[PDB]
Amino acid sequence: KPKGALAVILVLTLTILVFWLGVYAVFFARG
Amino acid sequence: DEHKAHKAILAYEKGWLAFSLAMLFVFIALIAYTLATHTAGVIPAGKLERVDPTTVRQEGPWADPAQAVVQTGPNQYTVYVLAFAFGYQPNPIEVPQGAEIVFKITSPDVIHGFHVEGTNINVEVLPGEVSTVRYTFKRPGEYRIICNQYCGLGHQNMFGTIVVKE
Amino acid sequence: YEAYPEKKATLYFLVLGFLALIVGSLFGPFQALNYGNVDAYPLLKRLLPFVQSYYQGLTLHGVLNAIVFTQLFAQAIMVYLPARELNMRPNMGLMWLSWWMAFIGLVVFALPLLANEATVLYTFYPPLKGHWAFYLGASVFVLSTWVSIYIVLDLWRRWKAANPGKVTPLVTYMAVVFWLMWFLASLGLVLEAVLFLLPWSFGLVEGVDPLVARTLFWWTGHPIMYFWLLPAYAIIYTILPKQAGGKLVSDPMARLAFLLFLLLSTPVGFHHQFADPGIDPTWKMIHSVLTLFVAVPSLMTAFTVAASLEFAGRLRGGRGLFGWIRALPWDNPAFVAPVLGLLGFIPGGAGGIVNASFTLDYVVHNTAWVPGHFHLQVASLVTLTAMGSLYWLLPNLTGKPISDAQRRLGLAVVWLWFLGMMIMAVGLHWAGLLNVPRRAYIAQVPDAYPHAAVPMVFNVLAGIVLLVALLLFIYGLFSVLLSRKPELAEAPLPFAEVISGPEDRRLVLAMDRIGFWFAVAAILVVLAYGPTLVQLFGHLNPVPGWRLW
Ligand code: HAS
Ligand code: HEM
Ligand SMILES: CCCCCCCC/C=C\CCCCCCCC(=O)OC[C@H](O)CO
Ligand code: CUA
Ligand SMILES: [O-][O-]
Ligand SMILES: [Cu+2]
């Protein structure tokens, strides 16, 4: 199995999620 | 080894492509949600509504900024905003808190932004068209308008004021 | 060189590209300090006296960095690479035609740019009215790609003619879908330029409809950014694997990515028009959904590319969960640039994804968030990729060799560049979250955004870091250019091998049905843009131009 690749996409997902959920919080705060 | 590695890489890329797909969908579902809620007031009415940028300051709801605020419901007001070079009329905009505010904003020269600081109201203003957004101010006080679209040299200093009345 | 005359044409497309990057970039560290609330424009005006405004610099910067350099590079890569893979010669007549069209269009557009005559920024939205030389010069420049489109479709068919019943070779499949995708994408701006922009600027018509022009623009607008990204992807896909010490893990996976970029690059452009009036929300919701889709191929790329590297690193003795990372050829800048670029691409697309979600766009639209986001995209991943090509393309093209020291200087530029772009990306995202508008000379209204004092320091720092990186790249570029050793010119391009697993012959063949996909892609454009455009042309309402500078 490709642990490194999986690792990288793990960082990718978390980033996307922190980014997305973050702005969505801010959207609802300004709403 | 190469035979084995290829088998696993592809096997796992697929899982990821499904997971990423799912996450993308869940986002879509969460965008749809907001579409169903009062916070979607800020999306511009996609209705075309042409006006004439040359005469707008002489005739119409933009010619007299002292009359730009008009009650349209028991708890809803329409405000007629001219974003221009370089500022906004009226100054300030005054509305009561808790009322639904239908912003009808147009330009007489170039394109400006109408971004109400501390809010979701962020809408391009194009000369020749009325841009319509809806917001209900929750906290009373003084909010700032910033022009966030390049409108010539006077851009950095182009601001306005909305004053929400307790 | 008298046998590979494609080398000289490719060379010119690169150098002019890099020239444009340098001139455009000079303005960057100045915009950086600006967003750090520090005013260094005085200094620059002494240094470059034609510069009349912060905004004149911002026009040059975007036009020269984002339009000129990126495309030249696209042209330099996506003609030559397929030409070498197929071991076949381009239509040299055409190949030169395209270069002259680009060089001539650029010189013409540069004249009013440098003359403070078309200070409208690279998006050039009406009713701000620039000098006709800008739009014509712009048009002729962009049309140069149509000649590249031809050349490569030419090469393609000739190969197929000589090799029927064979699947299109990888690089060539990527290149062909690339161009075909660009053609569709290019129609929007052509239309805008021809139907609207040119006549107006020439004075044939009195005004232009700002909404229709924004709509036609953002047709081309978005997929142009994939046209920018793809040549870098081509390199990351069909070369980086070898420079990293391994192979590309999947031929078909790479093709799928690219096929997806043909189908999904153009029909998504309201995402730039989320704050525009007169465009139905339902269509915005559509375009947002479709935009989200076009993220897939990059998401797919993320994995294909990462896995390729893990494999590369394991072959070099990497053991562990991290071992392979340290095992990679980090002393080699041709390898480093793109990898670093892909790294910053994580947070990059992460912001892209947010931007794409409709209502969330109102949180960040037209604020410093945006620039902060996209510098990871174009000003980093693409720019870096093109930078590390100095170390493998340039020697390939000119015989001239990369000294040991020059290599080390390369690592420096690349690294400091990547770091500057990170640092600036923090400051700008953060600042956009504080409502600081993009496209503003904010350092001239220094008491306007006090809450943004923290991120501003990152901006400033990024400014000086990136000034040092740029300076270093200038020195270095000219140290390579103004240096011929024999085997360095004739030795092959580091095209990677592909890992051995039965591929999907069934899919690779399907994907090879290019005529079909091209039509599909086009139908999508008609379906996604068609209705809105019909309604918009039905109710055109032109308005007077303005010159507010
Ligand atoms: C190079 C050029 C660009 C690309 C590509 C690009 C991609 C996208 N963009 Fe964008 N774009 C938007 C959405 C996206 C999305 C969904 C994507 C997608 O393609 C994103 C997909 C990417 C990913 C999901 C990341 C995958 C990660 C990878 C591939 C890296 C993996 C790392 C590895 C493998 C490294 C491993 C290494 C080790 C050794 C560990 C939206 C809205 O929906 C806005 C409008 C904002 C507004 O309101 O104005 C926008 C604005 C812009 C602007 C401003 C235009 C202007 O001036 O007004 C620019 C110039 C631009 C450029 C670019 N951006 N974009
Ligand atoms: C020394 C590196 C550079 C620095 C410090 C830098 C800095 C800047 C800054 C701070 C801005 C925002 C200015 C504003 O919104 O008012 C900007 C925008 C811009 N930059 Fe750069 N950048 C540089 C290199 C590049 C390069 C390599 C490109 C892409 C090839 C580029 C692409 C863009 C584009 C497209 C704009 C938007 C222009 C507009 O809004 O009209 N940057 N850059
Ligand atoms: C605010 C943020 C500003 C700070 C910027 C932080 C962003 C990430 C920086 C670098 C990523 C590099 C990660 C991979 C490490 C590469 C070095 C390496 O592995 O080198 C091996 C060594 O040479 C043995 O041979
Ligand atoms: Cu009005 Cu910028
Ligand atoms: O434009 O992404
Ligand atoms: Cu886009």
Short mmCIF file of C-alpha atoms and ligand atoms in Angstrom, two decimals, chain C residues 218 221-222 225-226 268 271-272, ligand 6:
data_model
loop_
_atom_site.label_atom_id
_atom_site.label_comp_id
_atom_site.label_asym_id
_atom_site.label_seq_id
_atom_site.Cartn_x
_atom_site.Cartn_y
_atom_site.Cartn_z
CA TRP C 218 -15.21 35.00 -17.87
CA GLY C 221 -11.56 33.86 -18.11
CA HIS C 222 -11.56 30.63 -16.13
CA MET C 225 -6.17 29.43 -15.85
CA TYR C 226 -6.11 25.75 -16.74
CA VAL C 268 -17.89 26.94 -15.08
CA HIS C 271 -17.84 31.45 -10.32
CA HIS C 272 -16.17 34.72 -11.17
CU CU D 6 -12.22 30.42 -12.37
#
